[model samples]
Target: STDTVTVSSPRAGLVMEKGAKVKYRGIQVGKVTDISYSGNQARLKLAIDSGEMGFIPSNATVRIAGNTIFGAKSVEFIPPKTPSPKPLSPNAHVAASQVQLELEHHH
Candidate 1:
């Protein structure tokens, strides 16, 4: 099963592309399929893959995270401390409420 979700970013300079990677924790669970705008927001569409739906919560934080400084950034999905019972719904339209654009330079 696959889930197509949409998330909008209100900040600028967040780098992403069509078919770019999407991650839950450090694992790749999906790909970004579109990049557009929503009245000053960066609108992105996501495609979550098969057998990877159970753990991702619908209501969670999203970070436009960079694994390496000056490298391309991917969307990071962060579920809650306890997590929601239901997974992300189809065509789920969510917004970037928490997390942030990060260097994640674990040194």
Candidate 2:
């Protein structure tokens, strides 16, 4: 869309820079278009697909994780059991709460 949907973290960690993948349920649906700062928070604007945006749940939680231990970080969207009654809006903004950084393990 042509509006603002942002994700932010209290402290910058890992390397979630511009052009980073923005995923929904482990699948790429967008990219991090820009990065900005507000006080001590590091915020990112996403360029998500207009069609794909229709399925994003309003209850989705914003997170950051990597495919491997030393791989690049990507933004993740997690929805609770039973998706929200409404989808996320163009003006939606999310901020990490705890343990946003994640490293994958296993085969």
Candidate 3:
């Protein structure tokens, strides 16, 4: 079975698209279902497995992340720093401003 959630980001750019993978700890956990736009914000619909739902906290965060410089792009889910009493509800929306961006530099 599958569950869904909406992840919002300030800007999705071009790398993120439907079918993009959502991962945690380098493991594939979910996939992007759709991409939508509202003004200057971008929202991604994600379809996650029922089993994996338990791994995510109610306060979890999602962001655009890449592996290596040009390897692959995926959505990264970050669990809350402290244990949460609940898990993210299906159909819940994660705010764009809440998603953190990862910065990388190569020498």
Task: Provide the overall lDDT of each model, using Cα atoms, as 2-decimal numbers.
Answer: 0.73, 0.71, 0.75
TM-score of each: 0.51, 0.50, 0.53
lDDT of model number 3: 0.75
Mind giving the per-residue lDDT tens digits that candidate 3 earns over 1-107? 78988877765553464587789888999888788877777777889898888988898776676543443456788777897898889999989898776655669
Q: Is candidate 1 or 3 superior in TM-score?
A: 3
Off by over 4 Å in 2: 1-3, 12-15, 66-107
lDDT of 1 by residue, 26-84 (tens): 99988988777656677777888767877877678887755433644587787779988
Clashes of 1: 0
C-alpha positional error of residue 50 in candidate 3 after TM-score superposition, expressed in Å: 1.5
Best by lDDT: 3
Inter-residue clash pairs, candidate 1:
none
Q: What is the lDDT of residue 9 in candidate 2?
A: 69
What C-alpha lDDT does candidate 2 achieve relative to the native structure?
Answer: 0.71
Note each model's CA RMSD in angstroms. Answer: 21.2, 21.1, 21.0
